[PDB]
């Protein structure tokens, strides 16, 4: 009588992943708390105001997808895993792209265009552009769920004394469908922030976004050979880990270094240092 096999919540790898979830989500909550602390401060305003808080919120809902992967599989869980991860991720990353856009409009685009376009990006239009990016993601997610859903596989002989249960993705294309929107946002952000350079005595915005994009790319690239090498039963663990580390890469390069100034060097929270 073969035993069914899937990740148990108590396994040390799942314990480690839910431990790392504590650091990721707690730091996200702490950064949101600090933003709430200095909400009206020009720093948060220069960082896009409330779009900043919303972004942090979205990031938490991204980490919230980590819970879907381990445990007894079901078809609903397999369907939900990818979209409910990447849709919040899009809701976050669109704002990073927007700030990257702001740095490009400021410091390469001629003034005659920039004076108008900077005011045109901000306001209701920033919120509606975030909504439009989420709409794209949702369309791609609908196409994925209908035409290319994953299948629950119970395999009876792939192991000596066990039957292996897990979600299996139809084609790498079906996953690529879900990774395109976020990948696109990252490409645009990097190209927008990479080559620009600031004057002295003003906040250095492009550097953090550049490091965030590089961390994102490196994480999701290293995630490939490991997912190819890892045992079939343990594929979820490297998925979860990516979602965690990817989120960490965004946190430690863009948000946390701003909270660092907010708490430990408040003299910089002055109007013309940002404006």
């Amino acid at each position: 009588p073969r035993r069914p096999k899937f990740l148990a919540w108590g396994e040390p790898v799942v314990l480690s992943l839910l431990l790392l979830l504590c650091l990721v989500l707690g730091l996200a909550l702490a950064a949101l708390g600090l933003s709430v602390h200095h909400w009206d401060s020009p720093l948060v305003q220069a960082s896009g105001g409330s779009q900043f808080c919303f972004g942090l919120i979205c990031l938490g809902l991204f980490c919230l997808s980590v819970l879907l992967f381990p445990g007894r599989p079901s078809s609903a869980s397999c369907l939900a895993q990818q979209p409910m991860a990447h849709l919040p991720l899009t809701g976050c990353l669109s704002t990073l792209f927007l700030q990257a856009a702001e740095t490009f409009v400021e410091s390469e685009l001629p003034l005659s265009w920039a004076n108008w376009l900077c005011s045109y990006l901000r306001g209701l239009w920033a919120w509606l552009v975030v909504l439009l990016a989420t709409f794209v993601e949702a369309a791609l997610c609908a196409w994925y769920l209908i035409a290319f859903p994953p299948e629950v596989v119970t395999d009876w002989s792939v192991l000596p004394t066990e039957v292996l249960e897990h979600c299996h993705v139809r084609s790498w294309v079906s996953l690529g469908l879900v990774h395109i929107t976020n990948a696109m946002l990252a490409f645009l952000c990097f190209l927008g922030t990479f080559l620009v350079q600031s004057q002295p005595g003003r906040y250095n915005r492009a550097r953090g976004l550049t490091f965030a994009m590089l961390a994102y790319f490196i994480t999701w690239v290293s995630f490939v050979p490991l997912l190819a090498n890892v045992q079939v039963a343990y594929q979820p663990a490297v998925q979860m880990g990516a979602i965690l580390v990817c989120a960490l890469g965004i946190l430690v390069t863009f948000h946390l270094p701003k909270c660092y100034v907010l708490l430990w060097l408040p003299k910089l929270n002055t109007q013309e240092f940002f404006l």
């Binding site: 990479f194 080559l195 350079q197 790319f217 690239v221 290293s222 490939v224 050979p225 190819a228």
Partner: protein, 278 residues
């Protein structure tokens, strides 16, 4: 069983051939433009002998595609595995060592006169560019002795009816040693150039070094990852494509921007202009 290799009947193969033709003709335009501007300030900053040779090596390299396509023979395995990699490494080392030369130059004279007083005269960074080159030879030529020369064959499991013919035994392991130094040089140049992206030196060439090195790094990482995930028939075409694109990145991304100043800013062509970029 059925042999498989690149042929002109394939749209992407002829597409790569056309892209390589575009690259070669554009690089020929670059060279013939430089050919009547030997001693202009921008060409003079280019590096003199270094720029002519680099351009020449690249003009040869574009011929790989016609020699890479078609039923393999050892005659093609010789070049596609050793010679063209040598042509490419000569250029990458040139770019990276120039990036080091530009940045941190200020510290060379004041803090390390014991070195700079001799390193300035008659060769300087050339020496390092030479040594890296032979170091790559130690990886390449002897490595080819280890694998031996053969247009080997392998099987693709989606249906073992068909077999790949390729000049690359143990492709992943073969490429790992080759790409270790490529990644080292690419990241070093990327770091030096990005830290120096503000400098105006040599008509602000650090920015263009940054662009080309970033493209090379991203493409190399992408191909190594993809090969670590995939082993099917397409590997050879993509590998060729990534090569040609990289060549473009070196040609259009570094010399292209300088040529974009040569003919279009005769003001900046002025010899007296150069002192303003010190």
């Amino acid at each position: 069983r059925q042999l498989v290799f690149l042929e002109w009947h394939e749209a992407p193969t002829i597409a790569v051939a056309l892209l390589a033709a575009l690259g070669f003709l554009s690089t020929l335009a670059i060279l013939v433009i430089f050919w009547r501007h030997f001693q202009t300030p921008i060409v003079r900053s280019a590096g003199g002998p270094m720029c002519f040779l680099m351009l020449t090596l690249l003009l040869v390299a574009y011929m790989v595609v016609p020699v890479y396509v078609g039923p393999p023979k050892v005659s093609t395995c010789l070049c596609r595995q050793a010679l063209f990699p040598l042509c490419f490494t000569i250029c990458i080392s040139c770019i990276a060592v120039r990036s080091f030369q530009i940045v941190c130059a200020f510290k060379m004279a004041s803090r390390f006169p014991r070195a700079y007083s001799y390193w300035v005269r008659y060769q300087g960074p050339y020496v390092s560019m030479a040594f890296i080159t032979v170091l790559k030879m130690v990886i390449v030529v002897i490595g080819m002795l280890a694998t031996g020369l053969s247009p080997t064959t392998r099987t693709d499991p989606d249906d073992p009816k068909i077999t790949i013919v390729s000049c690359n035994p143990n492709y992943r392991n073969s490429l790992l040693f080759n790409t270790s130094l490529d990644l080292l040089l690419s990241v070093v140049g990327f770091s030096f150039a990005y830290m120096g992206k503000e400098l105006p030196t040599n008509y602000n060439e650090a920015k263009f070094i940054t662009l080309s090195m970033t493209f090379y790094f991203t493409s190399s990482v992408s191909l190594c990852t993809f090969m670590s995930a995939y082993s099917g028939v397409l590997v050879t075409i993509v590998d060729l494509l990534v090569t040609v694109l990289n060549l473009l990145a070196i040609s259009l991304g570094y010399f292209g921007p300088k040529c974009y100043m040569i003919l279009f800013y005769p003001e900046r062509n002025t010899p007296a202009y150069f002192n303003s970029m010190i």
